[PDB]
Amino acid sequence: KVFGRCELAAAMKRHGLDNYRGYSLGNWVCAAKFESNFNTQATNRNTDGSTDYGILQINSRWWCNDGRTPGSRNLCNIPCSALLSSDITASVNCAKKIVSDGNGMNAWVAWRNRCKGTDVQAWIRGCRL
């Protein structure tokens, strides 16, 4: 599924991501925009052979099992395919584990290069939340 901007902001909000671990809603919508272009089915293969999955492009080397990343850790306890669902609950629960690691949202390279230090409030502007 491809989310609309305010539709995804509202879904992220209902699942407890606004201000989670100090990151306002809008950091999370900005990260999803540049990671997946709000598409839940987005996949991207990395040079090390691992693959990023879903709306928040969660990596198979540490966080999910895709059966083809030799050496992977599956810390969110879930097949990587569950992260491609139009229900974002799995991606939201795993993202919460990832931001809780000592790095915060710097784990997402597109948040670091194009959301971090920008007016991220713009991503939730006219939405009724």
Can you read off the two tokens belonging to residue 106? 């710097």
Can you read off the two tokens belonging to residue 53? 């999955």
Which residue of the set 35, 48, 66, 119 is catalytic? Answer: 35
48 is in an annotated binding site: no
52 labelled catalytic:
yes
In order, the DSSP letters of 65-117 are B-S--TT---TT-SBGGGGGSSS-HHHHHHHHHHHHTTTGGGGSHHHHHHTTT
Measured distance CA(44)–CA(39) in Å, rounded: 12
Q: What is the CA radius of gyration of the chain?
A: 14
Q: Which residues are marked as active site?
A: 35, 52
Annotated binding site: 101
Annotated binding site for substrate: 101
